[PDB]
Amino acid sequence: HARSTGSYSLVTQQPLGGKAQFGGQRFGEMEVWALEAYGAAYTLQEMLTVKSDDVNGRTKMYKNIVDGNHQMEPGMPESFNVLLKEIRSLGINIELEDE
Amino acid sequence: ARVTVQDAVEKIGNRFDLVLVAARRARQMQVGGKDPLVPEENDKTTVIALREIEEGLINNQILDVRERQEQQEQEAAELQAVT
Amino acid sequence: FGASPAIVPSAVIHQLSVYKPKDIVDPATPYPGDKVIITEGAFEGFQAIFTEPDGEARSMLLLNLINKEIKHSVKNTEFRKL
Amino acid sequence: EFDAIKIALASPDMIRSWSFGEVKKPETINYRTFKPERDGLFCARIFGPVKDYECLCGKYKRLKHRGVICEKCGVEVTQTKVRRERMGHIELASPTAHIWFLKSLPSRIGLLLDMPLRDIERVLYFESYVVIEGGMTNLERQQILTEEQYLDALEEFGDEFDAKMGAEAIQALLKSMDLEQECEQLREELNETNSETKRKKLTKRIKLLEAFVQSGNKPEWMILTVLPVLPPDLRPLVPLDGGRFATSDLNDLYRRVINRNNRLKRLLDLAAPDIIVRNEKRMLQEAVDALLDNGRRGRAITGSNKRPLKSLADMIKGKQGRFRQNLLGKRVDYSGRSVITVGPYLRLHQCGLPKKMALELFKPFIYGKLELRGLATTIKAAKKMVEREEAVVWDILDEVIREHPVLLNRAPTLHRLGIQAFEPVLIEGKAIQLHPLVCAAYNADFDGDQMAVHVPLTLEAQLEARALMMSTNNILSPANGEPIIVPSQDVVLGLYYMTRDCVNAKGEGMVLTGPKEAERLYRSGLASLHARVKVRITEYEKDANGELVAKTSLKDTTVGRAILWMIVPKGLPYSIVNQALGKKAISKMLNTCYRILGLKPTVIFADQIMYTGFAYAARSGASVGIDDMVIPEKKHEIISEAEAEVAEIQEQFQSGLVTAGERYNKVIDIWAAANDRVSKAMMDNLQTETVINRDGQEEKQVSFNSIYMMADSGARGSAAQIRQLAGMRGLMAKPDGSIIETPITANFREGLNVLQYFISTHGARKGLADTALKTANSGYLTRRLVDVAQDLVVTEDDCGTHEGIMMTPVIEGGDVKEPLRDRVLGRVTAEDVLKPGTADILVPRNTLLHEQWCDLLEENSVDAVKVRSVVSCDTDFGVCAHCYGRDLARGHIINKGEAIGVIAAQSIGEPGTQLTMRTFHESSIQVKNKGSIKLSNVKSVVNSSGKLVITSRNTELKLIDEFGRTKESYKVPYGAVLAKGDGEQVAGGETVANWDPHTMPVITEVSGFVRFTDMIDGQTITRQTDELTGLSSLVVLDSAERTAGGKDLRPALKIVDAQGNDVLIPGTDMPAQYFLPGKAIVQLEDGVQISSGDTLARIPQITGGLPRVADLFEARRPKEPAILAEISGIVSFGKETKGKRRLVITPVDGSDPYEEMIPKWRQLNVFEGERVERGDVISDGPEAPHDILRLRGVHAVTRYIVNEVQDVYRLQGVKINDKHIEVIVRQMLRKATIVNAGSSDFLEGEQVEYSRVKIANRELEANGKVGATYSRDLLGITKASLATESFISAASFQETTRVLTEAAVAGKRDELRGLKENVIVGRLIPAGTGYAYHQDRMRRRAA
RNA sequence: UGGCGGUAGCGUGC
DNA sequence: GGAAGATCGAAAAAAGCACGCTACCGCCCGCGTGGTGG
DNA sequence: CCACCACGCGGGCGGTAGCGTGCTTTTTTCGATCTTCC
Ligand SMILES: [Mg+2]
Ligand SMILES: [Zn+2]
Ligand SMILES: [Zn+2]
C-alpha cells in the first residue's frame, strides 16, 4: 500500500488510516522519539505539520512541489486548535500569549 | 554521486550547521537560479551543495559574505539606475 | 436526597391539595395576538400576528405582507412558536 | 507568532465573550430537510453557514456578499471553516460547580474552604444546608446543618442567620471571603504552630492562596454559571446510508443538559415546591458533571448498547485521548507499507523500492517534472498520463529518485536505529528489498515482516536524511559504542569456510607468487580452498607521519585466506585474516578497519566482505543432515550407570538411611553430573574426533562437520543448542519452579516419548507467556523513561565545575565484573590524575580519555579516576558538552544542541525485552589470587590465641595484587576471627577469616572476670537447663515478659579485675558494661576468667529483571528498609513503648534532638555501648534510596542506582554505558525543599525546582544578601515527569485531569523550552538542526 | 469511503 | 483526668496496563403519541 | 375499529428486585487506639 495524498478526517484534518480507506502510515510516538534522537528537527517539523494537519501548509507545499520549489510554511496544526477549543469548552481559558 | 558525508562533516566540524548551510546553498541554486562552482555529473541540488562544501568553496561565512556582496552590488545598481 | 428517600412535610401536601388555581402560562401559546415565526416559503424568518383559534387540528395565522396583514388558515405544525 | 501558553479558569464574562450566541433548544438537524433548527445545537445563525459564502435562506450565494449578515434568517455569509472556531454558550438556570475542581483530589473547593469533601458533596447534591452569614448567634460561618437542624434554627433564632442549599451556597461562600486576610491569618498560624502535619497543611493552603491571589482568577469563577459549547464541526453529525445520522456522545450530553435546564426553568416559572425544584437542580448538576467528566461520581450515563458515554474529558486523556492520538503521533501523507525481502546485490546505502510504490509516493514530483518538460499543460493531463503509465512517466520517475532518500522504519521503534534513510533503487514486484547488514540494526527477520517508507519532500529534510539518518553514518550503537554492522548468519559461515586449513588438501605445499595466482588456481579446480601453501604478499603499514609503507614477505597460509586478502584494504595488516576468522574475528577486523582507515573505506570493506561471504557460502554447499548430529557411543553406558546410582540411592532411602530431601538432592546432583559428562563426551566426539590420512600416515584435525562448522564459527546455534540436538536434553522444571527428578535422556535426533514432550512443554509455555506479558511492561517502562528525560539537551561547552564521580573498577566476590578501562573510556577527568607514589600529573584536568589515555592509565596501574558527571553538571536547563563526555556514536566529543535524554532513555529501554519479570527458585572467606591483604574500616583486637577479631560492623577485606591494584573485595562480618594478619601475602585457596553465620558471638576487648551482676532470675533472665549438657545457662528475658519491678534493671555483663569492680575500657572513662540484648545465650558461669577477643554470648540470627529496574527507577521504598544513623554520635536507649523502642543518638559535641522509633521485632546490628557515624547501617535490609540521598549525598545514591542497574543488565548479558543511567538519575534529582527561608521569598516548607533555587541563591550572593539552604529530593520517573515546570508535558503524559486542574488553578504560564511541547505545538524542536534556529530566537528576544 | 465495541490473526532473541 | 496531636493500620478511591497492521461481525436511541389509511 | 408511518421529548433496565464476583501501585481518609500532656 502507498499514498501520496487523498481523503482526510473531517474532525482532526488528518489523513485516514488503513489500506481500505487509502490512508497513510501512522508516525507514532516511538518514531517521533527516534527522530528527536537523530536530531532531524526539520524532518520532524515537516512530517508533523505540513504533511498531516496544516491544510494551508499542505496546499502550499503541493503547489510548491508542482512548481519545482522545495520549501514549506510550518503554519499551525489543526489538532492543536481542536484541543484548545475543547479545553475552552471545559470552562478553562487557555490561549497563546504572543508577548 | 555521494555516499558518505564524513569529509564534509569534518570540514564543517559541527554536523548540524552543515545541514543548514547545505540547505541554504541548495535553495540558492534551485530557487535563486544560481550556478554551481563545480561540474555536475547529473547530480541533485543537495548533492551538488554537499560536494561544493567538500572542497571548501562554500562555507557559512563565505556564503554570508557572498550574499552581502551580491546585495551591495544589487542596491548600488538600483540606486544608480534610480538616480 | 442522600441514601434514604426524602419525606415531604405534611404542610406541603396540604398546601398542594388546594394550591392549584389553574395556570394561564403555557409552553405553546395559540392565543390571538401572539407573534408566530414562519419557517416555510417567502415568509421564512418572519413573524406574524395570530388571528384566533379556529378549528381543532390547525389554527389560522395573519400573514404579514408589506402592504397589509391578512388572515389565512395554516397547519398547526406549519408555523413555529416565537 | 507566540512565545508562551497561558492557562487559567474562565470567568463567565470571558465565556460569554467567546460565544457568538446562546443555545436554547436541543434540536440539532431536521430529518425532512437537512438544515439545522433555530437556536439549536447546530444553528447556522449562532455558529455559521453550512456552505461556503452561501446564506442559509439562499438570498445571497456569491462571494460578492461576503461579510454581510442576511436579514431574512440572520446567518453571516462567510466560509464554512468559521464553524470550526465559533463557540456557543448556555445560560444555566442555577449555578453548578465544576466537577474537575470538586472531585479531583485534592478538592480545590474543600482546600480553599477548609471543610471536608463529604460536606461539600452533601451541600452540592442537596443533602444538608450550609450557613453563610453566621451573625451574632452561636452558629459559625461555615456550619453543616441537616433538615431538622435547619428547621430548628429557623424556628428559635429565625431572624438574621442565613443558610443556603446547593451550589449557590458554595458560590456565595467563595465570593464572601477575603484572600489577603485569610492568607495573613494562615501565615501567622503557621509561624505559631508546631505540628508537622498541621505545618504541612498550612503551607499547602498558604501556597494555594498565594497562587490564587497572584493570578487574576477569582474563587467565584470556580462555580460554573455559563456553559461553553463546542463548535459543531468538532462534534460532527456523520451522514449514514438510509437517512440515519450518527450522533456523537457530546451531542447527546449537550441535549440532556439543555433539556434539564429547560425543565428547571419551566418548573421555576410554575413556582414548584421546594423539594421538586431542589431535585431538579440536583439532576441538572448531575447532568453537567456527566457532560464535563462522565463516570467521576455516581452511575455513568450509558450508551445505546450499554457503554459509558464519551464526555469532554474522556477523549482528552488516555491512550485514545487527543494528546496521545493526534498530537504526539499522527498519520502522515507520502507514506507506504510493504513486506521486506533480502537483496544481496544492494549496497549499504541502497534499498529496493517497487516501481508501483515509488510511482504512488512520488506523484507530485512526477507531476511537476511532467509540467516542466511540457508533456502535460495541466494537472489533469499529468494525472491521466501518470495513471496510464507510459514510458515517459517511468523515465521521469527514474529521474526524480536519483538521489532522493527515503526513510524506512519498522513498527517496534525501540531506539533511533529503527528508522534509517536509504537511497531507492527501482525494482519490479511488491516487496521492499533490504540490505542484510542493516537487518541486525532493524531487528527484522524475513518471515513476514512489514516495514513502512516515508518520502522526505523538502531540501532540509532530504539533507538531514542524507547526513544524519543515512545507513552509512550509523555504524556505532549509541547505547554502548559497539559496532552494529556485523555479519550474522551466512557471511560468517562463508568466511569461516574459506579461511580454514585442511591437512592433505589438493595442491598443498605449493608456492604461489600472489593472491591472484591463488584465485586462478582455485577457480581452475587445481587447488583446494583449504590447501596450505606459501604466498609472497605485500602489506601496507601506516607510518607515524600518516603515510603507507609496503613490506613484501612470504607467508605460510591457505588458498582461501590469500583470496580473501585482496578485498582487505591496504592499511590493515595480514594477521587479521590468518586465522579461522569466526564471527568475533570478523567483527574485530571490521572494528580495526574503522579505527585505522576510517569510515569511507569501512563501508566498501563491509560490502566486499558480505559479497565474498555470500558467494563462498553458496559455493561451499553446507547442508544439515540426520547423520551430521552424531550420538556419542558412550551415552548408553553413562545413562546406565546414572540409572544404577539413582536406583541404589532410592533403595538406600527406602531402607531409611536418608530423608526425602537428601535423596532428592543426591538424585539431582547425579543427573546433573551425568548430563555434564554426556555433553562433554558429545563435544569431544564432535569437535576433533575426525581422522585424516596425511602424506604418509594418519593424524587428527578440526572437524569439518556442518553442525560443528556453524556452531564454532558463531553463525547460528550455541553449545547448549548442540547439546540439546545430540546430547541429552537435561533436567526440566515444572511451572512452579522446582526441578523434576527424572530428566529427558532422549536426543532431538532420536524420538521423544509422550511423557518427555509433555514435561518439556512447560518451559516453552512459561517462556512464551513471559515474553507476551513482558513486551507491554517493557514498552511502558520505555515510555516513562523517555518522558522523564524528554527535555535534556546539551546547551553549554564547559561549566568549570571541580566535582565528579571517583570511578573505580567494580568487584563482587572473587572476580572483577568490569575493568576500569571501559567504565572510564570516553569521559573527561574532573581533576588532574597523579602517578601513584610520584605526585606527578599524568592526565591534564580537562582532557577527554580516548584509547591512548586509557592505555596510559592502565600501564601506570591507576584504579580510582575522578571524572566529570552529568549529575554534577552546573549548567541549568540542560547539561554541558564537557560534563557529558564522549558522544559514544561518533569518534569526536559530543556535539552541542542535540538531545541526549531521549537517546539515553531509548538506550536503556531497548534491552527491556531481554529481561524477565517472572521470579523462580557461608562461614569463611576464600582467596583466589596471590597478593597482599588490606583491611579497611577495621578496629581489630588480638584474641587469646593471638588471632585477630574485628570490632567493626563495616569492615572490608581487599586482596591486592603485587602491582597495587585492588583485585578482590569482600565485606567481612563483624567479630570474625582472622587466620592471618594484615599486610601478609597469601596464596590462592587459603582462608583468611572465619565466622559463624548461624549465631553472632559477643566479642570482648578486655580481659578479666565476668560476674553475674544487675540481673535476677525470673525477672530479667532465666537460668535454663541445657537440653543435652544440662548446664544452667542464663537466657535474657525480653521486656515483653519482664517483670515490672525489674524493668529498669537492664541486664549488662561487666568485666571485673582482681579487685572485683568493672574494668574501664582502655581510653574510655565509661566502664566496660556489655548490655545484654534479647534472646542472649551465655554459657559461662559466674566469675569466669576470659581474655580479649573471647566469645561472651550468642545472639541468634531479591527480585530481578524488569520489576527490579522499575522499582529502582520509581524510587520505591523497600518493604524492609534498613535503619541508618542520620547523625554521628553514641547510641543509647531512652525508654520503650509497646512494640517500639526509643533509640537515641547523642553526638559528643552536638545536641540531642533525635528520638527514633525502632520496631521491636527489627534486629539491631548495633548494641548499647558502641559508636556510630553518619550513614551507618543499624538494621539488616536493603537501603532506601531516599535515605542514601539524604544522608550520604547525591554521589552515593547515584553510584548505588548505577551499580544496581548495571548488575541487573549484566546478569542478562546486556551492556549499557553508565551515561544514560547518570542522565536518568540527574533527571530524578530536580526538586529541593527549603530549610531556611533567608533573604529569598521561598517558603520554609516549599518544594522548588533546583535550578530556580540555585539561580536565586546566586543572585542573592551577588547582591550580598544571604541565600536559602536547600535539601535535594529523589522522585520516581512518573513523579518527576508529573512535577515539572511545563504543564503541557505533564498533561500529555498521564493523569491529565489533575495536571490541568493544577495549571488552571495556579494560572501557570508555560514556555515551550522542550521537545514534547514544541512537537505538540508544531514548531522546530530545540534539539539538533533546529537548535541553532531556536537560540537565534532567544537572542532575538534579547533585544 | 466516517467512527465505536467485540472477535481472530500478523511482525516482535533467534 | 479529659482533650488535642500522633499514628497506625485498615479500608476505599483513582489511574495504568508496548508499537505498527489486517480481516469479519454488530451498532450508530426509542418509545409513546398523533396522523392516516383500509 | 385496528394497524402502519412520522414526530417530538426524556435518560438504568426492568421490575410489583436485583444486577457484581481472577490486578497492581499510589494516594487519601477514617476509626480506633494511644499517648501525652497542662
Ligand atoms: Mg519474524
Ligand atoms: Zn438569509
Ligand atoms: Zn557541565
Summary tags:
part of a larger assembly; 4 chains; A: 99 residues; mainly alpha; 3 strands; C: 82 residues; mainly beta; 5-stranded antiparallel beta sheet; 1 helix; elongated; binds magnesium ion; binds zinc ion; DNA-binding; RNA-binding; transcription; transcription complex; pausing; backtracking
Briefly say what this structure is.
This is part of a larger assembly, with chains A (99 residues), B (83 residues), C (82 residues) and D (1343 residues). Chain A has 99 residues and is mainly alpha-helical. Chain A has helices at 29-38, 41-50, 55-66, 78-89, and strands at 2-3, 26-27, 92-97.
Count of discrete structural domains of chain A: 1
Give the overall form of chain C: elongated
User: Order of strands in the sheet with the most strands of chain C?
Assistant: 4-3-2-1-5
Oligomer: part of a larger assembly
Explain what the structure shows.
The structure is cut from a larger assembly and holds chains A (99 residues), B (83 residues), C (82 residues) and D (1343 residues). Chain A is mainly alpha-helical and 99 residues long. Chain A is built from four helices and three strands. Chain A has helices spanning 29-38, 41-50, 55-66, 78-89; strands at residues 2-3, 26-27, 92-97. Chain B has one domain: RNA polymerase subunit, RPB6/omega (Eukaryotic RPB6 RNA polymerase subunit), CATH 3.90.940.10. Chain B contains four helices and no strands. In chain B, α1 (6-12) packs across α3 (45-54) and α2 (17-30) packs across α3. Chain B is elongated, with a radius of gyration of 15 Å. By secondary structure, chain C is mainly beta. Chain C is built from one helix and five strands, in the order αβββββ. Chain C has one helix at 10-19, and strands at 36-38, 46-52, 58-64, 69-75, 79-81. Chain D is an alpha+beta fold and 1343 residues long. Chain D is 34% helix and 18% strand. Chain D has a six-stranded mixed beta sheet with strand order 12-14-13-16-11-15. Chain D has a five-stranded antiparallel beta sheet with strand order 32-39-38-35-34, with no helix packed on it. In chain D, α7 runs antiparallel to α8 (196-214). Chain B binds chain D through residues 1-9, 14-20, 22-23, 26-27, 30, 42-47, 49-50, and chain D through 347, 349, 402-404, 459-460, 462-464, 466-468, 470, 472-473, 598-600, 603, 890, 895, 897-898, 1328-1329, 1331-1332. The complex binds magnesium ion and zinc ion (2 copies). One zinc ion (ZN) is lined by residues 55-57, 59, 70, 72-73, 75 of chain D. The structure holds three DNA and RNA strands. Chain C: This is Transcription antitermination protein RfaH. Chain C: Interacts with both the nontemplate DNA and the RNA polymerase (RNAP). Monomer in solution. Chain C: Keywords: DNA-binding, Transcription, Transcription antitermination, Transcription regulation. Chain C: GO terms for molecular function: bacterial-type RNA polymerase core enzyme binding; DNA binding; regulatory RNA binding; transcription antitermination factor activity, DNA binding; translation activator activity. Chain C: Belongs to the RfaH family.
